[PDB]
């Protein structure tokens, strides 16, 4: 099994001209500076770029790359894409679920992992948690092994690695590379790229390639590089690193001169006489994606429990500040204030959703290009795993605590109307955050947008300004505000049977107006319906906003530039 | 000029046992792994650690380190401590102001820079801005040179560098090291530490030292290291990096065995026969510190102008939402809402104050240990440079825009009372944030805390809950809230002459109470004084809170563990 390519021009701006060569079954290495194409050619051969940007061919064993190539090959991202919050056994069962055949047995899913974890030397850390910043786990040198095992499930013959040495210590990375050398003879073609390599690494290769500023400088086996650059005019001095002396040529102890040397290289002429001989299930996809993020959710108390503690304490403090809202002239202010606060808090806590996707963006990109799932399977699974439970709970913690301490309307149905309304507003604010966060790797940007956004919406929520007293070319903005509908629903839920002028029954007549002596007068003065449709109109508005913002998130995750 | 030391035990946990040696006038290098003491010994010789943690001696030319040692020596931090928002000429004039004598001429301050910037090769980038993420500037390879020039003003004979190679490219760092080699022969003793060095770097040293897990393995000139480890039992193989082969010994191609080899080293015995021969103005300090941060403030539109544009829009949006607050039953809600919203807004921009000190924390530590300023000079200068102008402006932008659009009380004095009250609450929230963020290098911690405090202060400000209707064991918390005093002052400033029941004059009699038909009834019902002392009581409370929180910040910056 060999790779081959010819006449590759890649633009957006051509940081390339054309690269020619083949890669044998062995150990293929790409070296050079960061500004060079050493990181772009690897994405080309692993089909991780825009095909329209690609020009030449990728020919494998006399066949082009099919749609099946990504489903039987493995590319490993340089950062730890593993689930450090889970363990190796759990994560490798995840990667076995979405890559092995549905017909294959769960016994076979038990065995094929044990053919690999036994090979990686990770039998000690099988059930040991991999590791987080807040949970002590396995060393990173085996986090690299964990990712490699994640990309060895269906026995891919073609392996690709994004900088296998960066992020690890010296002897730490040697244990990875010797494992790969064990893979170098078992019929696995490893193609990777290393920045600042070492002679201990350099002494075990099979084929080598050098790129610099989008220009090709070497092709062929790795031993003869030192043999060729002697003829270029240099000599490797006494006791110098050969892999570092290969970069001694680059930056002036110019680029066009060295490339012209390579054009008249016999190593290129044999390749010229070689290439032109060549060139001449969904329920299962949701059964395990939900579980993985579920165990991420359990395996992080500092983000799951730490957002319940805040919910419980703030549930109790608000229970102590208000504590039995009186039906006097101050009752309107307190009830509206708390409803206000509970709604605003839901909204503003839901700017943490931007975390979910922004952190999981790079993992999503790699996992979909690998083909672990349909995008809708990811989207119906992760929302089932994190959007559902983490927002059902605080909408119940607040609801159970602050309801009977404050003495909010003592009916059975109103308790659950408040429960459901807080649940819906949590979902709706999270869905917006989901629409405004989808397809963005930056955090400080989005979080900044969400934050102004809610600050405008609260001005239209109805407490900071009376919505009926806004100029009519602004009163259409009161519909684009999530804190408006939930807050309106809560005011409708609680202010119906209430009275606030003690000793003054107002429901028959309100003498001396400008008084607000019943719940309906406050509710109407805010511009809120009194019919029972006026309650659930907010809920259907919020349900439509959930669906719309989730669809915008779905399209952004679909129309995203994955390459 | 030489350095010398003997029998150094450093604990908090002894990650050291004892290190012995002298450093000649030349090029002193410290190598090893990150877990070793290669970064701690350099802080020991530069007196950047706790002397109580230190055990042994530091003897210089037959004299111990005086208090004058830090005032005539230069340590350079690993990250770019330069002002990339300024230029080289401006920053080197800053470092000339606080290090050269007050008696020395401004002509001499013009010349001594030109004796150095000419030496560094930075004559091209003299007036060129150094560089920010949002302002294109000089390459980082000369940011390193910029910092070194900052630590060469009064001609220190003893130079110290924290990792001169990390953060730069290969040929990028060679230009720094050749400049230092030019400094290696001009009577300047450079003492530094390099992680993962190179033979191009290794071929130009004068003296060498190796540390590993708090154990010393080499001392003496740099050439003989390769000569000594041959006798240890190894041999440097063909075409290997000597500086990387020196770490080939460390991690098993154990620590106690190699240290015992070093105890019986002749290189140590000569040093044993050497060491025991040895061991046997404020107005000026505020004239230029204010200017530097002032030019940081001008040289960042994305943080200075970007926080004005927003104020300007919101001042216009709030100017459009409210626009001529009516004196009707809805007038109370609108006036209280806007006054609430303004106080809150000021408090929230105050939360970016942390970004002032948290970002400038490491620069503050290095600059005070160097002795550029008294702590109070830094504290009376930076507040004059950033706390003063960036909070006088929005308290005027809001004040000028939203006052006459909304039609707030049309008197001359009330306009300026609102102006001053917003100014004071901006200062007070910034002062609290500054006390919380004094002496903390983390952003996400405090920012979380300041938001938490504020969300609690607002619950007491007086809008979300009526302060008179709180249980008496909580009504003492209404004094620890900045949004209470400013909001109280604004309600006192605006609600005096107002009326809100049109057609119903209420100041003579209020028939049919529960009405709130004048400004005083709303103001008293909130628990706010009507005497003119009731206005300025808030201001004196806020002034005391400014002074107290600035004193807490001053003590945290004084009692900080600088080492």
């Amino acid at each position, epitope marked *: 099994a060999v790779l081959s390519f010819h006449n590759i021009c890649y633009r957006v701006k051509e940081i390339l001209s054309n690269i020619n060569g083949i890669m044998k079954p062995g150990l293929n290495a790409i070296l050079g500076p960061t500004g060079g194409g050493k990181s772009s050619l690897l994405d080309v051969l692993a089909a991780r770029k825009d095909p329209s940007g690609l020009s030449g061919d990728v020919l494998i064993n006399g066949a082009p790359r099919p749609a099946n190539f990504k489903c039987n090959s493995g590319y490993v991202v340089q950062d730890d894409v593993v689930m450090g919050t889970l363990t190796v056994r759990e994560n490798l069962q995840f990667s076995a679920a979405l890559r092995l055949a549905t017909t294959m047995t769960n016994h076979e899913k038990n065995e094929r992992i044990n053919r690999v974890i036994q090979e990686l030397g990770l039998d000690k850390v099988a059930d040991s948690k991999v590791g987080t910043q807040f949970i002590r786990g396995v060393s990173g040198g085996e986090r690299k092994r964990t990712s490699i095992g994640m990309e060895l499930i269906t026995d891919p013959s073609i392996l690709f690695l994004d900088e296998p040495t960066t992020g690890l210590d010296s002897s730490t990375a040697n244990a990875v590379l010797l494992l790969l050398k064990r893979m170098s003879k078992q019929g696995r073609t490893i193609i990777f790229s290393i920045h600042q390599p070492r002679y201990s690494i350099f002494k075990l290769f099979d084929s080598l390639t050098l790129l610099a500023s989008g220009r090709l400088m070497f092709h062929g086996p790795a031993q003869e590089a030192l043999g060729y650059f002697e003829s270029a005019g240099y000599h490797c001095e006494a006791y110098n690193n050969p892999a570092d002396f290969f970069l001694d040529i680059i930056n002036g102890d110019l680029i066009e001169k060295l490339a012209e040397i390579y054009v008249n290289s016999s190593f290129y002429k044999e390749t010229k006489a070689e290439l032109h001989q060549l060139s001449g299930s969904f329920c299962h996809q949701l059964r395990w994606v939900s579980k993985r993020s579920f165990k991420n959710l359990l395996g992080n108390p500092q983000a799951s429990i730490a957002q319940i503690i805040v919910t419980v304490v703030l549930g109790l403090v608000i229970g102590a500040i208000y504590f039995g809202l009186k039906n006097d002239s101050t009752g309107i202010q307190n009830r509206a204030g708390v409803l206000f606060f509970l709604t605003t808090n839901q909204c503003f806590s839901s700017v943490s959703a931007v975390e979910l996707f922004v952190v999981e963006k790079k993992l999503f990109i790699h996992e979909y290009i690998s083909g672990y799932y349909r995008v809708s399977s990811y989207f119906l699974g992760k929302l089932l795993s994190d959007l559902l439970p983490m927002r059902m709970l605080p909408s119940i913690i607040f609801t159970c605590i602050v309801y009977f301490m404050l003495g909010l309307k003592p009916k059975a149905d109103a308790f659950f109307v408040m429960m459901f309304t807080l649940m819906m507003v949590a979902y709706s604010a999270s869905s917006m955050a989901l629409a405004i966060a989808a397809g963005q790797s930056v955090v400080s940007v989005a979080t900044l947008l969400m934050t102004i956004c809610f600050v405008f919406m609260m001005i239209f929520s109805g407490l900071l300004v009376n919505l009926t007293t806004i100029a009519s070319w602004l009163s259409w903005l009161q519909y684009f505000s999530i804190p408006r509908y939930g807050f309106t629903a809560l005011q409708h839920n609680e202010f119906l049977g209430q009275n606030f002028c003690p000793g003054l029954n107002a429901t028959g007549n309100n003498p001396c107006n400008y008084a607000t002596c019943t719940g309906e007068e406050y509710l109407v003065k805010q511009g809120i319906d009194l019919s029972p449709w006026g309650l659930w109109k907010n809920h259907v508005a919020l349900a439509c906003m959930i669906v719309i913002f989730l669809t915008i998130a779905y399209l952004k995750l679909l129309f995203l530039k994955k390459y | 000029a030489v350095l010398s030391f003997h029998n150094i035990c450093y604990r908090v946990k002894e990650i050291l046992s004892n290190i012995n040696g002298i450093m000649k006038p030349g090029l002193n290098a410290i190598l090893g792994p990150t877990g070793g003491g290669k970064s701690s010994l350099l802080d020991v010789l530069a007196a950047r650690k706790d002397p109580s943690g230190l055990s042994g001696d530091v003897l210089i030319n037959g004299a111990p380190r005086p208090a004058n040692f830090k005032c005539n020596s230069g340590y350079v931090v690993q990250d770019d401590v330069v002002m990339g928002t300024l230029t080289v000429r401006e920053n080197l004039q800053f470092s000339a102001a606080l290090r050269l004598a007050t008696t020395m001429t401004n002509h001499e301050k013009n010349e001594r820079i030109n004796r150095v910037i000419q030496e560094l090769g930075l004559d091209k980038v003299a007036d060129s801005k150094v560089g920010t993420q949002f302002i294109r500037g000089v390459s980082g390879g000369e940011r390193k040179r910029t910092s070194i020039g900052m630590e060469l003003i009064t001609d220190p004979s003893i130079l110290f560098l924290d990792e001169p190679t990390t953060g730069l490219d290969s040929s990028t760092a060679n230009a720094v090291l050749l400049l230092l080699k030019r400094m290696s022969k001009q009577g300047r003793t450079i003492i530094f530490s390099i992680h993962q060095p190179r033979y191009s770097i290794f071929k130009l040293f004068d003296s060498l030292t190796l540390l590993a897990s708090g154990r010393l393995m080499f001392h003496g000139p740099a050439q003989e290291a390769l000569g000594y480890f041959e006798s240890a039992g190894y041999h440097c193989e063909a075409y290997n990096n000597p500086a990387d082969f020196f770490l080939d010994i460390i991690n098993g191609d154990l620590i106690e065995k190699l240290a015992e080899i070093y105890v019986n080293s002749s290189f140590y015995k000569e040093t044993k026969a050497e060491l025991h021969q040895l061991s046997g103005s404020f107005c000026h300090q505020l004239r230029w510190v204010s200017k530097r941060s002032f030019k940081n403030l001008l040289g960042n539109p994305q943080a200075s102008i970007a926080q004005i544009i927003v104020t300007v829009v919101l001042g216009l949006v709030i100017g459009a939402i409210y626009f001529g607050l009516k004196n009707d039953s809805t007038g109370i809600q609108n006036r209280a809402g806007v006054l609430f919203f303004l106080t809150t807004n000021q408090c929230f921009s105050s939360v970016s104050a942390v970004e002032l000190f948290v970002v400038e924390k490491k620069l503050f530590i290095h600059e005070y240990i160097s002795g550029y300023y008294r702590v109070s000079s830094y504290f009376l200068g930076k507040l004059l440079s950033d706390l003063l102008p960036m909070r006088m402006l929005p308290s005027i932008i809001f004040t000028c825009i939203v006052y006459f659009m909304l039609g707030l009380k049309p008197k001359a004095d009330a306009f300026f009372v609102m102006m001053f009250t917003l100014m004071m609450v901006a200062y007070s929230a910034s002062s609290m944030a500054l006390a919380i963020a004094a002496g903390q290098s983390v952003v996400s911690v405090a920012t979380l805390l300041m938001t938490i405090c504020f969300v609690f202060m607002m619950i007491f400000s007086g809008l979300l809950v009526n302060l008179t209707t709180i249980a008496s064991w909580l009504s003492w918390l209404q004094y620890f809230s900045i949004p209470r005093y400013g909001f109280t002052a604004l309600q006192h400033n605006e609600f005096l002459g107002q009326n809100f029941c*049109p057609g119903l004059n209420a100041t003579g009699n209020n028939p049919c109470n529960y009405a709130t038909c004048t400004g005083e009834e709303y103001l008293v019902k909130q628990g706010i004084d009507l005497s003119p002392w009731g206005l300025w009581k808030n201001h004196v409370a806020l002034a005391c809170m400014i002074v107290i929180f600035l004193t807490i910040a001053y003590l945290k910056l004084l009692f900080l563990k600088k080492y």
Partner: antibody
Amino acid sequence: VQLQESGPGLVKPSQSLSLTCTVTGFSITSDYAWNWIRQFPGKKLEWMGYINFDGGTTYNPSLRGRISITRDTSKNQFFLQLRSVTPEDTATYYCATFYGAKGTLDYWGQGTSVTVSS
Amino acid sequence: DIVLTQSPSSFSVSLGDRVTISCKASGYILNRLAWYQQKPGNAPRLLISGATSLETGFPSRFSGTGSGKDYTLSISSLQTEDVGTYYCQQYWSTPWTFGGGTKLEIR
């Protein structure tokens, strides 16, 4: 308590209109709000706007920029100044007195008619 | 705004009859519904405030029975001196729109 109008019962179109309501039995600076009404032929009433007891005023938003109400407090008068008068609003005009707490048009004028023709 | 539709623009009744004048509102008024009575050649005399109260200077026959939006006036056994033009007014909002005004007749 006792209101009465006195003004021109005719006007040329598109120039102006002046009416004056002199209040006796009560002082217009004391308690109430004072508003104008007009009733068209083909009777439909149309409230026009009120001046508060303290000079503040609010006008019917259909009549923007056209109606203004001033007051001469030293003799208890308030003035209806209606500009750019179309011939269509040739209604019968009234001045009326609003309680604020009772909320209703408690007292009314006598009734002055304005005919806008040429 | 709030428009007050007196859907029965007129009537044709006789003496001693209970007539019921509706006043359908285009929004909740909450008993802020006044009733006037304009005899021809006069200003509208106030008849009923608050949609349930009464004004001194009338018999106990005019009586408003309104709730929500469907306010109405009941004249039980009307007299000769009670034919007129009854205007219902909302004094809830600021633009105090009146009703169209029904007009009683004698058959």
